[PDB]
Amino acid sequence: ARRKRTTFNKTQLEILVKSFNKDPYPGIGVREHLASLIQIPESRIQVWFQNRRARQ
Amino acid sequence: ARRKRTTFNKTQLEILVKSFNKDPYPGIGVREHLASLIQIPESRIQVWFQNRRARQ
DNA sequence: GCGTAATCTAATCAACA
DNA sequence: TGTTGATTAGATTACGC
Lengths: 56, 56
Fold this sequence. Notes:
The structure is a homodimer.
Chain A: H1 10-22, H2 28-38, H3 42-55
The structure holds a DNA duplex.
């Protein structure tokens, strides 16, 4: 079975979109910073960035 | 920009290889169980399983 | 129901002994 | 220098709202 679908609120999405507009390929440091900031596991943020680059 | 390379000891590798021989496609439950068991983040275990299925 | 999170493979890079 | 963990680009499948 798959994990439960991670849900992002308005603030988390806004922060992630700003970070994406700054750099679409964030290193491990910035990814972990975003993880601690919006309280979302770093793996989920990496998946989000991959999907975001995929739609764009 | 990459994360530090995850290092596995003998026991972690043994448990992961046993789980792989049992099921090469573990669900989220089994992955999180292995994560809690060998104390390694679930994303690292998913990456390890992907690489293992890739080289075999 | 749509958007998008999650997952898999295939290919490539690089780092820690 | 080698093994193998880490990353990314595509295709998918399938929940959360």
